[PDB]
Design a protein around this ligand. Structure first.
Ligand SMILES: OC[C@@H]1[C@@H](O)[C@H](O)[C@@H](O)CN1CCCCCCNc1cc(-c2cccnn2)cc(C2CC2)c1
Length: 763
């Protein structure tokens, strides 16, 4: 409880809006939020096209991301904007104190690059909103006639934050001056503030709100006879009339000519004295020092990646992953019809389920909150369930208490049945980035339970103030156990939910196997896809069939039982632990009985024939390796040995750039959208690397084969992601096994960041 409050207080504030370039919000649904906008202005019509706010990635943006980051302390982001001729730095720092989650400060620095006109005009906006019924926020008016010569102070209060002040400092840089007539009514040019109110639920719509203000300014020009015969300069046409006051929205606008910088200082009143700029500079310097010392300990890169080039790389991949952390809040779109069509018990079920979907019974429910890292700032900045399992593996190394918060956050979404939606789209802001057709979540749709892998890591660590807090759940064995005590029932709920909702059919067919009980089938497959497995278009039995069994799914259930054995034990859930043991033992047998192909030398999914018999359907690739990847096979297993041969075999899976998702010998290799049908994916390569190492560091017949494969695969995977990063500045979603090129999505940090841990080794 004491550790709990110290964690809460520690993690409350951050730049938890990874969907925008730079903004802040605390981990409270309805509260104070800030966000940055900037754009060059060269004409009367360009600013609407140049202005930056929500993250994107196109030819106008060289790249962006976190150089250093730690959600407890803060960090530094670099933004390389080609369109706007600007290299921007955003430094953010947290200053503990008081009773309301502390203070914070940020510095916004813009440096024109060599290509930009030295006299560029850049509009900068700091947009501040506050949601809540009994809360207040007011801009203190300036002394000067038409705007502010120096600092802008907002005073506010709420129940969550108590009293606070938020200051936007004068900053440094040339502020352009207009000789136009308009300057008699609008000033020659200066910082301005508009203070406004809108219904709370739209405050997130910062760009439209700003533009509506800009447009009203222009309408006033037109009305008041400022015209094309003699027009004010663009930057002055686009500078709002100063109108500070009280409201739930405050727009702070500046125009700078040339290079600029300014500070934002949030001062919690319950803390000591207020935050100054000199405080900002010191806390930033200190944060870097600490970041440096922790990285070197937690991620000590081993040969042959000990060099500085690899260090910078690891720092980038890590900082982007942990820097993705957001806080999301709002309603989600869910079909709670539980239409019987979703049971998928008939042949041709996909058409039935489509019919049900076409009823559109989904409705908004919640609100929910989620504190999570994310795969992709520009393209999908939101929680994905099996992704988060991988994200937290390096995060847990860094700060186990952080990882546990995020696990806890995820589990608090689970409904009464044991279901967590695979994709968390929370609130109208998150929804804006997502077509309607893809918002709806389905209570029968699972996703791999990869969060158990993180739990497994914590368990091993448990058995063997920002520095202290990071590791309080391991350094106090009782803290750890209580966490496990409270989560355990939800883990069990999820286990049972898998076995209720994703059950395969043994008893109803000509099917023999050691267990009558253990068989699984992912719900939600279409003719070409199986989105729930995580391996979108990996080839599965055709056509899809209520008789299908999926070897990956059963392996995940294996992962789950094993975790439950260890957690069950620690809590002395004797009766539970006996039941799990029997489940484990049956999965071990049934994987062989239902999924092993002796003819093919690997595991395979299964269906039933035109003639009602169990047929194996083998497509050599990631799926085929699943019992090995999930840690389920004995190190002396002949089956394992056969998979090692498949893994190392260049004509099948082994490319110079890592393991191919699908074999070059498979008929579906490089077909269709070719998503999981040949490319190299880091998440699955990471599981391979870890399992190879496990076998390499243990007595057995495959020790030396495993050592060789581990050595090379680690090399191949790290070097592929490193070369791509070096060339392009990006982590990529997947890598081309023929060319080694990164392809699909950039800014995928994202499980590609697992490469930090691969380099650091010592599993
Ligand atoms: O990592 C999560 C999952 C994993 O769980 C799965 O295992 C894995 O199979 C797929 N990934 C990703 C699945 C995300 C589906 C939604 C993406 N929609 C989207 C794509 C792009 C885009 C632009 C350019 C190039 N390509 N794409 C742009 C937008 C826009 C805001 C405008 C949205």
């Amino acid at each position: 409880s004491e550790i709990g409050r110290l964690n809460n207080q520690s993690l409350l504030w951050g730049p938890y809006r990874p969907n925008i370039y730079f903004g802040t919000r605390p981990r409270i649904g309805k509260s104070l939020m800030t966000g940055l906008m900037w754009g060059k202005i060269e004409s009367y019509t360009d600013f609407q096209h140049t202005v930056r706010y929500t993250c994107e990635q196109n030819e106008g943006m060289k790249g962006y991301g976190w150089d250093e980051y730690d959600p407890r302390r803060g960090g530094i982001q670099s933004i390389h904007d080609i369109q706007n001729g600007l290299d921007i730095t955003t430094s953010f720092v947290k200053i503990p104190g008081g009773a309301h989650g502390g203070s914070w400060a940020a510095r916004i620095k813009g440096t024109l690059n060599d290509d930009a006109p030295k006299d560029q005009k850049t509009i900068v906006v700091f947009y501040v909103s506050q949601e809540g019924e009994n809360s207040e926020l007011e801009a203190v008016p300036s002394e000067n006639e038409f705007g502010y010569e120096g600092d802008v102070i907002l005073k506010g209060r709420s129940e969550a934050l108590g009293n606070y002040k938020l200051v936007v400092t004068k900053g440094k840089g040339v502020i352009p001056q207009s000789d136009h007539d308009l300057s008699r009514l609008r000033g020659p040019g200066q910082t301005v503030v508009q203070s406004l109110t809108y219904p709370d639920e739209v405050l997130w719509q910062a760009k439209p709100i700003l533009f509506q203000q800009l447009k009203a300014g222009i309408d006033w020009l037109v009305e008041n006879k400022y015209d094309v015969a003699d027009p004010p300069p663009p930057w002055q046409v686009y500078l709002l009339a100063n109108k500070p006051g009280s409201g739930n929205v405050h727009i702070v606008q500046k125009v700078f000519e040339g290079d600029f910088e300014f500070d934002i200082l949030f001062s919690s009143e319950s803390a000591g004295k207020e935050v100054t700029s000199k405080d900002l500079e010191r806390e930033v310097k200190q944060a870097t020092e600490v970041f440096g010392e922790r990285f070197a300990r937690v991620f000590d890169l081993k040969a042959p990646f000990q060099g500085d080039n690899y260090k910078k790389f690891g720092k980038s991949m890590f900082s982007n992953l942990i820097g993705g952390i957001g806080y999301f809040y709002g309603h989600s779109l869910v079909d709670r019809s539980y239409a019987p069509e979703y049971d998928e018990e008939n042949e041709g079920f996909w058409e039935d389920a489509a019919e049900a979907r076409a009823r559109h019974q989904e409705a908004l429910e919640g609100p929910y909150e989620l504190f999570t890292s994310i795969p992709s700032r520009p393209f999908f900045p939101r929680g994905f369930l099996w992704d988060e399992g991988f994200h937290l593996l390096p995060i847990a190394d860094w700060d186990i208490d952080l990882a546990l918060e995020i696990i806890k956050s995820w589990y608090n979404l689970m409904d009464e049945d044991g279901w967590i939606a695979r994709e968390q789209i929370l609130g109208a802001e998150a929804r804006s980035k997502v077509p309607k057709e893809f918002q709806t979540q389905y209570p029968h749709y699972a996703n791999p339970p990869t969060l158990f892998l993180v739990l497994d890591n914590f368990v091993e660590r448990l058995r063997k103030l920002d520095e202290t807090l990071s590791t309080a759940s391991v350094d106090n064995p009782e803290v750890g156990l209580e966490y496990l005590r409270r989560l355990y029932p939800l883990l069990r709920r999820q286990f049972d939910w898998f076995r209720k909702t994703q059950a395969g059919d043994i008893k109803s067919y000509d099917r023999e196997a050691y267990s009558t009980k253990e068989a699984y089938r992912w719900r939600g497959r279409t003719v070409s896809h199986c989105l729930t497995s995580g391996l979108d278009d990996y080839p599965r039995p055709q056509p899809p069939h209520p008789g299908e069994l999926h070897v990956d799914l059963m392996s995940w259930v294996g992962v789950m039982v094993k975790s439950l054995i260890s957690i069950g034990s620690l809590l002395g859930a004797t009766e539970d632990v006996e039941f799990y043991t029997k489940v484990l033992d049956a999965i071990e047998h049934n994987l062989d009985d239902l999924h092993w192909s002796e003819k093919e030398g690997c595991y395979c999914d299964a269906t039933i024939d035109e003639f009602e018999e169990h047929k194996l359907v083998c497509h050599k690739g990631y799926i085929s390796l699943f019992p090995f990847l999930t840690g389920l096979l004995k190190p002396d297993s002949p089956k394992l040995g056969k998979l090692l041969a498949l893994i190392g075999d260049e004509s099948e899976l082994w490319s110079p750039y890592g393991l191919r998702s699908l074999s070059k010998k498979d008929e579906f290799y490089g077909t269709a959208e070719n998503y999981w049908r040949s490319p190299v994916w880091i998440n699955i390569n990471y599981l391979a690397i870890v399992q190879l190492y496990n076998i390499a560091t243990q007595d057995g017949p495959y020790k030396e084969t495993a050592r060789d494969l581990y050595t090379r695969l680690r090399k191949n995977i790290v070097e592929t992601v490193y070369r791509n990063w070096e060339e392009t500045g990006f982590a990529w979603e997947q890598y081309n096994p023929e060319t080694g090129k990164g392809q699909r999505t950039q800014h995928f940090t994202g499980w590609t960041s697992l490469v930090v841990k691969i380099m650091s080794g010592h599993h």
